[PDB]
Amino acid sequence: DFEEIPEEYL
Amino acid sequence: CGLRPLFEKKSLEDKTERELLESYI
Amino acid sequence: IVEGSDAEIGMSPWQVMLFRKSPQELLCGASLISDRWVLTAAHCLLYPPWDKNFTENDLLVRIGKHSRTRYERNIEKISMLEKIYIHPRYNWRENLDRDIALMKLKKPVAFSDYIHPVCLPDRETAASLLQAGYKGRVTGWGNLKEGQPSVLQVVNLPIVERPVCKDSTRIRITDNMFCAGYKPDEGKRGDACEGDSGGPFVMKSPFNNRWYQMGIVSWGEGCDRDGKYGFYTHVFRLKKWIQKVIDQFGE
Ligand SMILES: *[C@@](O)(c1nc2ccccc2s1)[C@H](CCCNC(=N)N)NC(=O)[C@@H]1CCCN1C(=O)[C@H](N)Cc1ccccc1
Ligand code: NA
Ligand code: NA
């Protein structure tokens, strides 16, 4: 239920 | 280190830090 | 945390979130000790009975967080690890003795109202504060009960005397560990709980009024049981080790 993070991060 | 911007820095105290300090006999 | 409360904003700006890229999910707590160094529990990275063995590439470090779940768009800073360092004598096979690790950030983080490091105790600071009766504070986004909170939780707990610690369990307790919580008589509750691991046990010095990290959430049996206590990595006893890697590898 974790909101999505910026792909710049992964 | 250990001096919080929103608290120590402006000389404000958090809601329960005194419970800490009062335990230090 | 069990029986704690929501943290106020900026109350624990050294609080870090250990974050799994995939499945993206909360691994453990951690603490910021400088702009490039994070302190955690070695069992958050390496724990063979459960098949845990994380590498740098597997993780993200989230700093300046309040919400468990949201990406805090102009508040939190996410970082990549350059390197992981675990206590060579960490004991995962029996009691989690020396449960500590250091993480070197790829790039230094900029401090802010929400992001600021905690101090590491000194012999004399440890000496006056690490006392039975003295209270410390624990923080984390872990289990609420032996489910997950929406916001960072905090709890104040008293340090307990070694013998009581020792008599509460069958696991072998070492000098690299201390236990905290209220006695059942005492009638006040609170504990850390699964998911809180690797988070800071801090005390505020009455001498220079800075916040010092005395312990790291380590292990317990159940959460908030009467006659039982949380166990923490005694940070001061392991200081030299720490001194050693920062001094041989970064800053
Ligand atoms: C902490 O939140 C975690 N670490 C891991 C790492 C990977 C997966 C999931 C999590 S949970 C947790 C903190 C417990 C605090 N409890 C109280 N204060 N009441 N730690 C653990 O669960 C550790 C890690 C392995 C086993 N743990 C235990 O606490 C066992 N219940 C007891 C134990 C102690 C020593 C050796 C083996 C077992
Ligand atoms: Na015992
Ligand atoms: Na207990």
CA dist., res. C139 & res. C197, Å (int): 10
C52 and C68 share one domain: yes
Q: Are residues C227 and C123 in the same domain?
A: yes
Q: Ligand 1 centroid vs B10 CA: distance in angstroms? A: 37
Please provide the DSSP assignment of C160-174 as one string: --HHHHHHT-SS---
Asked if A7 reaches chain C (Cβ–Cβ under 8 Å), the answer is no
Phi/psi for C117 (5° steps) reads -80, 160
Residues 6+ apart with CB under 8 A from C185: none
Alpha helices in chain C (DSSP H): 123-129, 162-167, 239-249
Residue type, position B5, single letter:
P
Q: Which structural domain, as residue segments, surrounds residue B5?
A: 1-25
CA C241 to chain CA centroid, nearest Å: 17
Q: Domain residues for C46?
A: 13-117+237-250
The experimental technique used to determine this model is X-ray
Flag if B2 and C136 touch (Cβ within 8 Å): no
**C19 - beta bridge partners?**
C26, C60
Resolution of this structure in Å: 2.3
> Within this chain, do residues C130 and C225 fall inside the same structural domain, yes or no?
yes
C127 interfacial to chain B (CB closer than 8 Å) = no
Please calculate the CA angle C1-C35-C56 and round it to the nearest 5 degrees.
70
| Same domain as C125, residue C79 | no
Q: Which of B2, B15, B20 sits opposite C118 (nearest CB)?
A: B2
Task: Say if residue C139 is in the same domain as residue C163.
Answer: yes
Instruction: Give kind and range of the element (H or E) at residue C19.
Output: strand C15-21
CATH number at residue B1: 4.10.140.10
Nearest to C50, CA basis, from C27, C24, C21: C27
* Given C99, C191, C196, C224, the catalytic residue: C99
Residues C112 and C130 in one domain: no
Q: Which residue carries 């069992």 as its tokens?
A: C43
| Start-to-end CA span in chain C (Å) | 33
- One domain, residues C83 and C145: no
Asked if C10 has any chain B CB less than 8 Å from its own CB, the reply is yes
Single out the residue of C102, C106, C111 nearest to residue C248, CA to CA: C102
Closest to C9 measured CA to CA, from C49, C65, C55 = C65
Please check whether residues C25 and C84 belong to one and the same domain.
yes
**C26 and C88 assigned to the same domain:** yes
- Domain CATH number, residue C109: 2.40.10.10
Q: In this structure, which residues have their CB less than 5 angstroms from ion ligand 3?
A: C 181, 225, 228
Quick one: closest CA in C to B21, which residue? C206
Chain A residue with minimal CA distance to C69?
A2
Q: Give chain B's domain count.
A: 1
- Contact (CB<8Å) B23/C129: no
Distance C183 CA to ligand 2 centre (A): 16
Strand partners of residue C30: C16
Are C142 and C192 contained in the same domain? yes
Q: Are residues C22 and C101 in the same domain?
A: yes
